[model samples]
Target: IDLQKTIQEEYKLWKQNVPFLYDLVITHALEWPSLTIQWLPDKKTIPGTDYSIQRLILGTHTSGNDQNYLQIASVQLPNFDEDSYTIEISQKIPHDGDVNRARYMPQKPEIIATMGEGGNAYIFDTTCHDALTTGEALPQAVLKGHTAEGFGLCWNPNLPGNLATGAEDQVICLWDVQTQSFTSSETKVISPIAKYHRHTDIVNDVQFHPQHEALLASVSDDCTLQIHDTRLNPEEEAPKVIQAHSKAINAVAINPFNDYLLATASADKTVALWDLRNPYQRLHTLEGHEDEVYGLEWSPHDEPILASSSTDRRVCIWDLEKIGEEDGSPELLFMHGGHTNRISEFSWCPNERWVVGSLADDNILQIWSPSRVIWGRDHV
Candidate 1:
């Protein structure tokens, strides 16, 4: 029967198919495993997890009347054979109204604060996100005084209980979180401590400087970006203001490494980078998005890499360092088109290897891994 000859014939047939099998596996290696979330986060993924997207919380008004919900979920990263991650909804509690913004406290990661159209703010102790006991269920406190829809909220990274909210009423209010009662009755609420109404129009975003205490920046529909020193009287003191964009400035983000460098996204379809040292000049204008740019973030790793998402249905990754080195103005590294609709926002994982963005429609979220943009790319 020539047994050895027969085995060689079979081995050659299997070797012929190996290249085809290898091609299929290589696609995943390059395509990247992304998570399509119905919702979205404020920080790089939380610590103490295998770069697993630790916890994500979102706010929604489904029925519009009183049917508002705050959902907290734990993300499940994909396995070696898996193609997509998952969103395990841990807490879905009825909320006051649509939550425009939800921020987790840096000091106390279990505490989450939300503010939106309800004209007030709610704070929840999310330590028990999966099955909150009777006393632990829902928000533990509320803050009032905003007259119109509240749009922006941020927790001071350097201070405990120091939170701020921006609203359509042209005001930025500061709140101090304090525990009021004892044992079973213990609760925390951001009590209004100070109000800054320096902007003539609706304040679209509020951001605290990464290092400075009492230093924050606010962007507005008025087309101006203003930096405020909370220690001084906001009304009497003129903040360092610049007509940052030709259109309304919708979002502002400060650089984590260089406290003086900052970025702003606008309805004008542009992202502007500025140096507080030369507050009036426009350092660089990143112009690639086709529509209003909404989600603008600086990378968590100390690189000049910046990412922007927009209603244009694309997310652009930029290398400001490249632009600085070359005469070319804005150097774009990668432009990703994975979202089906307008992208509302995206968060860069602290690991700096991935980014997760949410869509405004179709209840979808997409994650972009290092493989999707650059392979074996080190922080340069």
Candidate 2:
């Protein structure tokens, strides 16, 4: 009880400092905590005003008796004053199990894929009217291959329907949704077109290269990062594997601006930067979080800027350009200490620069950006 009181007091102090710490901050309480959160690529501007409607993909993690859902929500981004901004649920599709992760197809934003806690992946077409209104709505298709629950999910940018998933079973499955037929009334079950079994332990995350059509990467609990090329058979060719971290790697991200740059977050409480061309040594290590890092993302707008969330309940922003400048960690530009609990997942908004949406275990979804004064200057 004493510990709980201290936690509340700490949160109260943080809340009091929010206005000074953030340029914009909005928090919405959820019905249940979400393990995943991502900003949709598109946004609509309200005419004659700076306010715009931005959408996000989220899923509910509920108890056994409660109904789980894949949620699409819209938030009104404010202009100068943050007084009238609001968040509203636009659509809800029934889900079979707790959603561990959710991501939208880069080319076709209406099509969404979710990772289920039951070890299956479900795809939904949000444009389907029946799926939004009917409580009995089923997924348009299901990808069934993993033997255990998974969190790693991504769609290839170069190839629209090409997707990848990594699981605790220590396997990475690749699927070609474009080749599958979903015309039948019964939910179509699809199998992986290719499976890679090189990871020795739980496969933590998988990501496709932004420009390379046949290349992808995966990180594992075995502390290895493997880069795979689709052109080669798994049995005949070996992937370029790197001993990435001292502990389990939880997430991996490829820089959109630089195809050769890659970032990985680990349970060792550090984020490592690597060059794909060299493949052997790390370029730099970002050390700010006090606990295990769970999420990492490169800003789509800035080539050198990266953001990472950790169990330490803080989000650290790093500018790679400042790597070796100061006595202290010069790369560490700003830290957002708004979340009161461990952050499960976070995503950088593709439509807005420096804006991010993050989900925490405490059922609070926070959308925020650092004050212009902090980001406009050299350092914070």
Candidate 3:
């Protein structure tokens, strides 16, 4: 078909330009695609070489009959002068179903949370001895409440033990991991401390505000963005809701640098920027992706930079500072077109400037940084 040939030709062109387009790029093939990819906070320098080891978390998305795993992988980050690199599987934890999303506790990186294909959410203690072994292993804790499978999961950055999840069942659940009675060594089954039922359709994503401990944000298939205050009862005080998109909103990300600024990706093939102070109107619209925008994250190092991945098989980087400066897509800084299939998710390296790790539905994982000439020498 013409569609197949077009994809093949585009990939060929991208491969030919890899050397020039990328400052650093390393690809690894997986047996199955990982729906989520997140960089671990820790990194160590190799004593005798100019290389450092960086770790990341991923999960296998296998069919019902195949065994799936929560994987931890390490990559050797080479020096600018070195051209060679390596990636190795460091750990594997058995998981029950497909991992829709995975995030480590910000306050304690050893503790991780994952959204399962089933309605259940799981918490894993990476430091547990059994978690590192290849044999059967169980999660430290299990969260049960949602009636349907979901993808939204986040840990409150300001409140260490607080966690939140949004689900396809049209509800959001909040849990406090610290409140659970963990005197026993066995797996703990916990329930939500509170549940909110404001979204009319599937709740796709949820995020806790960076500075406000009680403030939480969520986006849903109802095309609405709602902010809730956990301190107040939902029956007593209603959440602030806005009609954010023309289509279903898939993800929401709060800016680390500016607490009031947030971005939302939607099925309408666009990303919107809004300010919490002026919740009634959107600040700007980012239109570039040809398909649904599935994920977006703001750069932790740069205040104005953000990255988005989509079904279009490209990750587009935008610099808000460059808005209104040029004729065509002035704000668009770079487009990573290396993936041959739809990108499932991507993460900005928290410790490294401009470094990103992305996973695609084709079972390919790529870690790359833009060429200095493209992103500029200052960013490097």
Candidate 4:
């Protein structure tokens, strides 16, 4: 049965465990492993990169009474004592912030934290990084700046001191925590120094310019990716705008090797590559995920490679050169996680190899990688 052997080859295919369902969390796939549970209402297989977001939902059911539970109880840090999630990174809040996948500084002590989602900046300290598979005490505020979106953030690779954040309010902000008066919006002294707002939707992703700390980019629900030169006159009030996707921009990642390039995923059910030449021109459009494609991150070590999840209950990887440069020869590596329940968010292990994702409704997190398929295979 070579056919059946490879038939159920991928563990988390959209049709597995449950039939077609939910799309509300259709975008959660963008941030899988970290947040593995999501609710999808529509019970239909997502085809390509064109579906309905309103159709997706959380807390949907699959087989006999089995539901995904992502509540904090289902997500005990250090270890998902319950069979909730297969992948577990750290539930203990790092001294720098929360573990909600908000931000991570992979430096000394492996700085990791959760600046409360949509809340003011707050980072906590963790005594253990490896032994930290369980929960920790509430965070003790450390870094402080934003009062909104805080959708995505990264410490400057170059400056390391400067921090950039994409907000739900459609703004990209740069902050020098070392600088003064940057606590809240009430104090105008903590200005972003640069602002760009062309999108009518929420801003979700932002990070420092790959090589130069002075440069930063922001992605928004408005389906636009923007680049900013923080060093330029702050009064410009504009940025180099690039349209990377068609729907609400979910995530963005810069090729650690190719600083001038990056990828984005969106509710448009597509992932796109962008560069300086035609910043807005769609370089590579991956319609692999058949739903509101979400979570996206370029492998830290894998060059020109990216992985993402979606409403299809599947995770896919793309080798840029191997696909477009080659003859669409893309390698699809996968594993089973959950049903149509949105496999929304994921965070990379500090070591840079494995990834952990969060399931929106299933209340589970799972680890993913290439491995032996233990089910059906002909043996000697």
Candidate 5:
């Protein structure tokens, strides 16, 4: 496939000169150990210690799960004390009676799921998925505790097993995975540790700041992005709040490599980036879409590279890598279209070589894999 030449051309035009993106992918991932990187800053532990760095593994072969009608509220780690070393699949048995919640055990393939409407999450042992139909309880446990309908769930990367949830009940709940039962200490929870409900309207998303373990950011119908620092007294209001977008900000993403930068999208058909470190940061707004931006994803290799899709029938790619900086001109790389309706989500594969955009109304999963998506493990 002449994928390399095409990628080179597109990337060149997007970069305004030339880049190694086409060359980079052609050099790695196609034959590598994994798409993850090692930690250098946290290497202060003793050399004789036994703490293992996490690995990226995907779950497969599970009970036939329906992703359509159930609606995905959020995906999170069941135990904040433990990394998402594995995933679990679960099923709801009406007899258990949590109706809105479900009981489960970690599945062999590790699929994590929340049962019914009560926000009760369970991890079914994927190893015995077939045993589910054999008239057994399928062995499960309850995530426990939450007052209302859970609409969104996200696992904190900075804090393992720690979970954050957004509910239509107009509240965001932070759960200490350890407090949920099945062999966990009670001292770890009960005191939210940290909490944020800065939004007046229903909060749509409550995601942690990418590089800041102490901070969590949220967006809601209130039309703003609020940043909460767990370090400060949890009793005080959010430490930082940005009126990022004019109307109902839906998605907020921080650069994985840079702590002081932010990218936000909204219902007002706009996307913007902020240098949270800057004073009088009079906002540098990105304009390209004529409709509300639903999804926002930043390139891991570079913070300035952001991708957004919207109800405007387009997925606009932007390069703000140089935004507010000298000779930094961010523009639309290309507006990916063809969706029948609103694009509510966009995920950049860990590889950073491709992107996946999910359309809510069309019920279609759009995969954007370039031919240059292949790469060798060592960047050969």
Candidate 6:
């Protein structure tokens, strides 16, 4: 029953029965092996450029204890490989410890904030190129507020000086780096403005509200997500807690466009959509992954789009625009990709078109984009 034995037989069948053809495709891409990937926020993008941020800052592991570094390089659109076009050189920054996460400051695009295995979060300003060569690119601030490894680090959306850290210590501490008091002569020691704890187990992820800088969300292995507002009550705050999943909630994301919308990925193999306005009412429970969903991200440009990756070796895109029918199932846009192993992390680019994913064991990064399915009804 093989139809592609010859062209004449295929043409005959196409003329007799087939009027149109449909196919799946990937529009844009980049492929490079890295541990974690994130697109910079809106402020980091240069206007009139095709790619937002246009650079990839990735963590790399070396032999022995040489894990204290990250590399910065530019990625060409569509090609997504190691060679060709523009600046393809990889510049490395030594963090003095294993870099767990490296993030660009929303307000200052030139400065990068990083968390490491050394149980501290450090900052480096990338504007000075001389620092990297002289090994003088030392961290400006070594924040020692967390007891154990800092697993989660998020900068407040509107406040650049403010940072939130979640660790295995079962605690969340908000770090304040006074940008106003910063000087070349003095390196001010960073400290936590408020330290809070509620979850019984490890806190996995944290995110800040898009509009409200003080209001944030934290998820934990204890299976709960807490909403905290520093403006109201810093210490004795009564937070809104949601039992997000039966298993551990691994990741949480706040919609960049909507302050009321929240997305959570859990070990229960389900992604839950929550609206903060209604508080307890679950808007939708996106169930498609056959394994634990560890990563979740909302599109920065499009309001109704989201992407999630799982331990099932799949990346699924959910469309909120199509959730109007009797069945509340989310619209799965793209699920097919090249990860034979479980995907650990994935993120939507700030441009809102491309998605990049990292595999757990394969040492590979997969980039995917939405493709158009064009159809023309005709019999040739």
Judging by lDDT against the true structure, name the best candidate.
Answer: 3
RMSD (Å) of each candidate, 1 decimal:
10.7, 2.6, 2.7, 12.6, 11.5, 8.0
Number of clashing residue pairs in every model? 0, 0, 0, 73, 34, 2
Q: Estimate, for each residue in 152-237, the C-alpha lDDT of model 4 and write its tens digit.
A: 66677676446666656655556554422222212222335455555567777776756666767777888778777777775575
lDDT of 6 by residue, 1-380 (tens): 12235534543653343223212122222233345666544424455665433566666544455445666766544322221224343566666655666777788866667777656777766654343344355566677788877667888869877888888888888888755443333335577888887778988888888799778899999999889987765667446888878899989988888879998989998989999887677788888899888888887777887888888777787877767643435376556445555665666666434445344434555445544331111213
Worst 10 residues of 3 by lDDT: 178-187
* Candidate 5 to truth, TM: 0.61
Global lDDT for candidate 1?
0.68
Task: Give a tens-digit lDDT track for model 1, residues 146-247.
Answer: 898877888898988799899998889888885333122344444588888688999988988889978889999999999888888756654688888999
Q: Over 4 Å off in model 3, which ranges? A: 1-3, 80-83, 131-135, 179-185, 236-238, 377-380
Model 1 Cα shift for residue 158 (angstroms): 0.8
Model 2: C-alpha RMSD to truth? 2.6
- Residue 235, model 1: Cα distance from true site in angstroms: 2.8
Tens digits of per-residue lDDT for model 2, 191-262: 999888898999989999999998889999999998999878855444698998999999999999898999
Question: Per-residue alpha-carbon lDDT of model 5 for 81-117, expressed as tens digits?
Answer: 2122221223222222222211111111133333333
Work out how many backbone clashes candidate 6 has. Answer: 2
Candidate 3 yields a Cα-based lDDT of: 0.87
* Residue clash pairs of candidate 6: 30-80, 68-97
- Provide the overall lDDT of each model, using Cα atoms, as 2-decimal numbers: 0.68, 0.87, 0.87, 0.50, 0.48, 0.67
Candidate 2: residue 301 lDDT (0-100): 90
